[PDB]
């Protein structure tokens, strides 16, 4: 779903959590 770096939903999108390890997806999606 979201495979990009970010700190505060700066690069993330579509309700994608952002952390030190970049953005995250749901249900293990691309």
PDBQT receptor file of N, H, CA, C and O in Angstrom, charges set to zero:
ATOM      1  N   UNK A   1       0.828  -1.201   0.000  1.00  0.00    +0.000 N 
ATOM      2  CA  UNK A   1       0.000   0.000   0.000  1.00  0.00    +0.000 C 
ATOM      3  C   UNK A   1       0.866   1.257   0.000  1.00  0.00    +0.000 C 
ATOM      4  O   UNK A   1       0.771   2.087  -0.904  1.00  0.00    +0.000 OA
ATOM      5  N   UNK A   2       1.707   1.386   1.019  1.00  0.00    +0.000 N 
ATOM      6  H   UNK A   2       1.784   0.712   1.753  1.00  0.00    +0.000 HD
ATOM      7  CA  UNK A   2       2.590   2.540   1.139  1.00  0.00    +0.000 C 
ATOM      8  C   UNK A   2       4.008   2.106   1.507  1.00  0.00    +0.000 C 
ATOM      9  O   UNK A   2       4.262   1.677   2.633  1.00  0.00    +0.000 OA
ATOM     10  N   UNK A   3       4.923   2.220   0.551  1.00  0.00    +0.000 N 
ATOM     11  H   UNK A   3       4.717   2.568  -0.363  1.00  0.00    +0.000 HD
ATOM     12  CA  UNK A   3       6.312   1.840   0.773  1.00  0.00    +0.000 C 
ATOM     13  C   UNK A   3       7.245   3.025   0.545  1.00  0.00    +0.000 C 
ATOM     14  O   UNK A   3       8.089   2.997  -0.350  1.00  0.00    +0.000 OA
ATOM     15  N   UNK A   4       7.085   4.063   1.358  1.00  0.00    +0.000 N 
ATOM     16  H   UNK A   4       6.399   4.085   2.085  1.00  0.00    +0.000 HD
ATOM     17  CA  UNK A   4       7.914   5.259   1.245  1.00  0.00    +0.000 C 
ATOM     18  C   UNK A   4       8.286   5.795   2.623  1.00  0.00    +0.000 C 
ATOM     19  O   UNK A   4       7.570   5.572   3.600  1.00  0.00    +0.000 OA
ATOM     20  N   UNK A   5       9.409   6.504   2.694  1.00  0.00    +0.000 N 
ATOM     21  H   UNK A   5       9.990   6.685   1.900  1.00  0.00    +0.000 HD
ATOM     22  CA  UNK A   5       9.878   7.070   3.953  1.00  0.00    +0.000 C 
ATOM     23  C   UNK A   5       9.019   8.262   4.366  1.00  0.00    +0.000 C 
ATOM     24  O   UNK A   5       8.444   8.947   3.520  1.00  0.00    +0.000 OA
ATOM     25  N   UNK A   6       8.939   8.501   5.671  1.00  0.00    +0.000 N 
ATOM     26  H   UNK A   6       9.407   7.944   6.358  1.00  0.00    +0.000 HD
ATOM     27  CA  UNK A   6       8.152   9.609   6.198  1.00  0.00    +0.000 C 
ATOM     28  C   UNK A   6       8.343   9.742   7.706  1.00  0.00    +0.000 C 
ATOM     29  O   UNK A   6       8.862   8.836   8.357  1.00  0.00    +0.000 OA
ATOM     30  N   UNK A   7       7.920  10.877   8.251  1.00  0.00    +0.000 N 
ATOM     31  H   UNK A   7       7.498  11.614   7.722  1.00  0.00    +0.000 HD
ATOM     32  CA  UNK A   7       8.046  11.129   9.683  1.00  0.00    +0.000 C 
ATOM     33  C   UNK A   7       6.689  11.455  10.299  1.00  0.00    +0.000 C 
ATOM     34  O   UNK A   7       6.341  10.937  11.361  1.00  0.00    +0.000 OA
ATOM     35  N   UNK A   8       5.930  12.314   9.629  1.00  0.00    +0.000 N 
ATOM     36  H   UNK A   8       6.213  12.734   8.767  1.00  0.00    +0.000 HD
ATOM     37  CA  UNK A   8       4.613  12.711  10.113  1.00  0.00    +0.000 C 
ATOM     38  C   UNK A   8       3.604  12.757   8.970  1.00  0.00    +0.000 C 
ATOM     39  O   UNK A   8       3.059  13.815   8.653  1.00  0.00    +0.000 OA
ATOM     40  N   UNK A   9       3.362  11.603   8.356  1.00  0.00    +0.000 N 
ATOM     41  H   UNK A   9       3.805  10.744   8.614  1.00  0.00    +0.000 HD
ATOM     42  CA  UNK A   9       2.418  11.511   7.248  1.00  0.00    +0.000 C 
ATOM     43  C   UNK A   9       2.753  12.531   6.163  1.00  0.00    +0.000 C 
ATOM     44  O   UNK A   9       1.869  12.999   5.446  1.00  0.00    +0.000 OA
ATOM     45  N   UNK A  10       4.034  12.869   6.050  1.00  0.00    +0.000 N 
ATOM     46  H   UNK A  10       4.752  12.489   6.632  1.00  0.00    +0.000 HD
ATOM     47  CA  UNK A  10       4.483  13.836   5.056  1.00  0.00    +0.000 C 
ATOM     48  C   UNK A  10       4.479  13.223   3.659  1.00  0.00    +0.000 C 
ATOM     49  O   UNK A  10       4.127  13.884   2.682  1.00  0.00    +0.000 OA
ATOM     50  N   UNK A  11       4.871  11.957   3.574  1.00  0.00    +0.000 N 
ATOM     51  H   UNK A  11       5.156  11.420   4.368  1.00  0.00    +0.000 HD
ATOM     52  CA  UNK A  11       4.910  11.252   2.298  1.00  0.00    +0.000 C 
ATOM     53  C   UNK A  11       3.821  10.187   2.233  1.00  0.00    +0.000 C 
ATOM     54  O   UNK A  11       3.384   9.800   1.149  1.00  0.00    +0.000 OA
ATOM     55  N   UNK A  12       3.387   9.717   3.398  1.00  0.00    +0.000 N 
ATOM     56  H   UNK A  12       3.742  10.031   4.279  1.00  0.00    +0.000 HD
ATOM     57  CA  UNK A  12       2.350   8.696   3.473  1.00  0.00    +0.000 C 
ATOM     58  C   UNK A  12       1.031   9.216   2.911  1.00  0.00    +0.000 C 
ATOM     59  O   UNK A  12       0.840  10.425   2.772  1.00  0.00    +0.000 OA
ATOM     60  N   UNK A  13       0.126   8.298   2.590  1.00  0.00    +0.000 N 
ATOM     61  H   UNK A  13       0.282   7.316   2.702  1.00  0.00    +0.000 HD
ATOM     62  CA  UNK A  13      -1.175   8.663   2.045  1.00  0.00    +0.000 C 
ATOM     63  C   UNK A  13      -2.172   7.518   2.188  1.00  0.00    +0.000 C 
ATOM     64  O   UNK A  13      -1.789   6.384   2.476  1.00  0.00    +0.000 OA
ATOM     65  N   UNK A  14      -3.449   7.823   1.986  1.00  0.00    +0.000 N 
ATOM     66  H   UNK A  14      -3.760   8.745   1.753  1.00  0.00    +0.000 HD
ATOM     67  CA  UNK A  14      -4.502   6.819   2.097  1.00  0.00    +0.000 C 
ATOM     68  C   UNK A  14      -4.515   6.198   3.490  1.00  0.00    +0.000 C 
ATOM     69  O   UNK A  14      -4.519   4.976   3.634  1.00  0.00    +0.000 OA
ATOM     70  N   UNK A  15      -4.522   7.049   4.510  1.00  0.00    +0.000 N 
ATOM     71  H   UNK A  15      -4.519   8.042   4.393  1.00  0.00    +0.000 HD
ATOM     72  CA  UNK A  15      -4.535   6.585   5.894  1.00  0.00    +0.000 C 
ATOM     73  C   UNK A  15      -3.417   5.576   6.138  1.00  0.00    +0.000 C 
ATOM     74  O   UNK A  15      -3.664   4.465   6.607  1.00  0.00    +0.000 OA
ATOM     75  N   UNK A  16      -2.189   5.972   5.818  1.00  0.00    +0.000 N 
ATOM     76  H   UNK A  16      -1.989   6.875   5.438  1.00  0.00    +0.000 HD
ATOM     77  CA  UNK A  16      -1.033   5.102   6.001  1.00  0.00    +0.000 C 
ATOM     78  C   UNK A  16      -0.161   5.593   7.154  1.00  0.00    +0.000 C 
ATOM     79  O   UNK A  16       0.400   6.687   7.097  1.00  0.00    +0.000 OA
ATOM     80  N   UNK A  17      -0.054   4.777   8.196  1.00  0.00    +0.000 N 
ATOM     81  H   UNK A  17      -0.510   3.888   8.243  1.00  0.00    +0.000 HD
ATOM     82  CA  UNK A  17       0.749   5.127   9.361  1.00  0.00    +0.000 C 
ATOM     83  C   UNK A  17       2.194   5.418   8.964  1.00  0.00    +0.000 C 
ATOM     84  O   UNK A  17       2.722   4.821   8.026  1.00  0.00    +0.000 OA
ATOM     85  N   UNK A  18       2.825   6.339   9.686  1.00  0.00    +0.000 N 
ATOM     86  H   UNK A  18       2.396   6.824  10.448  1.00  0.00    +0.000 HD
ATOM     87  CA  UNK A  18       4.208   6.710   9.411  1.00  0.00    +0.000 C 
ATOM     88  C   UNK A  18       5.059   6.607  10.673  1.00  0.00    +0.000 C 
ATOM     89  O   UNK A  18       4.658   7.067  11.742  1.00  0.00    +0.000 OA
ATOM     90  N   UNK A  19       6.235   6.000  10.541  1.00  0.00    +0.000 N 
ATOM     91  H   UNK A  19       6.561   5.626   9.673  1.00  0.00    +0.000 HD
ATOM     92  CA  UNK A  19       7.142   5.836  11.670  1.00  0.00    +0.000 C 
ATOM     93  C   UNK A  19       8.597   5.907  11.220  1.00  0.00    +0.000 C 
ATOM     94  O   UNK A  19       8.883   6.170  10.052  1.00  0.00    +0.000 OA
ATOM     95  N   UNK A  20       9.511   5.671  12.155  1.00  0.00    +0.000 N 
ATOM     96  H   UNK A  20       9.279   5.457  13.104  1.00  0.00    +0.000 HD
ATOM     97  CA  UNK A  20      10.939   5.709  11.854  1.00  0.00    +0.000 C 
ATOM     98  C   UNK A  20      11.287   4.728  10.739  1.00  0.00    +0.000 C 
ATOM     99  O   UNK A  20      12.284   4.899  10.037  1.00  0.00    +0.000 OA
ATOM    100  N   UNK A  21      10.456   3.701  10.583  1.00  0.00    +0.000 N 
ATOM    101  H   UNK A  21       9.646   3.562  11.152  1.00  0.00    +0.000 HD
ATOM    102  CA  UNK A  21      10.677   2.691   9.555  1.00  0.00    +0.000 C 
ATOM    103  C   UNK A  21       9.875   3.012   8.297  1.00  0.00    +0.000 C 
ATOM    104  O   UNK A  21       9.550   2.120   7.513  1.00  0.00    +0.000 OA
ATOM    105  N   UNK A  22       9.559   4.291   8.112  1.00  0.00    +0.000 N 
ATOM    106  H   UNK A  22       9.823   5.015   8.749  1.00  0.00    +0.000 HD
ATOM    107  CA  UNK A  22       8.798   4.707   6.949  1.00  0.00    +0.000 C 
ATOM    108  C   UNK A  22       7.303   4.540   7.144  1.00  0.00    +0.000 C 
ATOM    109  O   UNK A  22       6.823   4.456   8.275  1.00  0.00    +0.000 OA
ATOM    110  N   UNK A  23       6.567   4.490   6.040  1.00  0.00    +0.000 N 
ATOM    111  H   UNK A  23       6.956   4.558   5.122  1.00  0.00    +0.000 HD
ATOM    112  CA  UNK A  23       5.118   4.332   6.093  1.00  0.00    +0.000 C 
ATOM    113  C   UNK A  23       4.734   2.861   6.210  1.00  0.00    +0.000 C 
ATOM    114  O   UNK A  23       5.555   1.975   5.971  1.00  0.00    +0.000 OA
ATOM    115  N   UNK A  24       3.481   2.609   6.580  1.00  0.00    +0.000 N 
ATOM    116  H   UNK A  24       2.814   3.328   6.774  1.00  0.00    +0.000 HD
ATOM    117  CA  UNK A  24       3.011   1.243   6.722  1.00  0.00    +0.000 C 
ATOM    118  C   UNK A  24       1.699   1.004   6.002  1.00  0.00    +0.000 C 
ATOM    119  O   UNK A  24       0.962   1.947   5.711  1.00  0.00    +0.000 OA
ATOM    120  N   UNK A  25       1.405  -0.259   5.713  1.00  0.00    +0.000 N 
ATOM    121  H   UNK A  25       2.004  -1.025   5.949  1.00  0.00    +0.000 HD
ATOM    122  CA  UNK A  25       0.173  -0.619   5.023  1.00  0.00    +0.000 C 
ATOM    123  C   UNK A  25      -0.731  -1.461   5.915  1.00  0.00    +0.000 C 
ATOM    124  O   UNK A  25      -0.352  -1.826   7.028  1.00  0.00    +0.000 OA
ATOM    125  N   UNK A  26      -1.928  -1.764   5.422  1.00  0.00    +0.000 N 
ATOM    126  H   UNK A  26      -2.236  -1.467   4.519  1.00  0.00    +0.000 HD
ATOM    127  CA  UNK A  26      -2.886  -2.562   6.175  1.00  0.00    +0.000 C 
ATOM    128  C   UNK A  26      -3.085  -3.931   5.537  1.00  0.00    +0.000 C 
ATOM    129  O   UNK A  26      -3.029  -4.069   4.315  1.00  0.00    +0.000 OA
ATOM    130  N   UNK A  27      -3.315  -4.940   6.372  1.00  0.00    +0.000 N 
ATOM    131  H   UNK A  27      -3.360  -4.828   7.364  1.00  0.00    +0.000 HD
ATOM    132  CA  UNK A  27      -3.521  -6.300   5.888  1.00  0.00    +0.000 C 
ATOM    133  C   UNK A  27      -2.327  -6.770   5.061  1.00  0.00    +0.000 C 
ATOM    134  O   UNK A  27      -2.462  -7.634   4.194  1.00  0.00    +0.000 OA
ATOM    135  N   UNK A  28      -1.161  -6.195   5.337  1.00  0.00    +0.000 N 
ATOM    136  H   UNK A  28      -1.051  -5.494   6.041  1.00  0.00    +0.000 HD
ATOM    137  CA  UNK A  28       0.040  -6.569   4.612  1.00  0.00    +0.000 C 
ATOM    138  C   UNK A  28      -0.093  -6.348   3.119  1.00  0.00    +0.000 C 
ATOM    139  O   UNK A  28       0.289  -7.204   2.322  1.00  0.00    +0.000 OA
ATOM    140  N   UNK A  29      -0.636  -5.196   2.738  1.00  0.00    +0.000 N 
ATOM    141  H   UNK A  29      -0.946  -4.501   3.386  1.00  0.00    +0.000 HD
ATOM    142  CA  UNK A  29      -0.819  -4.866   1.330  1.00  0.00    +0.000 C 
ATOM    143  C   UNK A  29       0.352  -4.042   0.806  1.00  0.00    +0.000 C 
ATOM    144  O   UNK A  29       1.096  -3.443   1.582  1.00  0.00    +0.000 OA
ATOM    145  N   UNK A  30       0.511  -4.019  -0.526  1.00  0.00    +0.000 N 
ATOM    146  H   UNK A  30      -0.093  -4.506  -1.157  1.00  0.00    +0.000 HD
ATOM    147  CA  UNK A  30       1.588  -3.271  -1.182  1.00  0.00    +0.000 C 
ATOM    148  C   UNK A  30       1.392  -1.763  -1.080  1.00  0.00    +0.000 C 
ATOM    149  O   UNK A  30       2.215  -0.998  -1.583  1.00  0.00    +0.000 OA
TER     150      UNK A  30
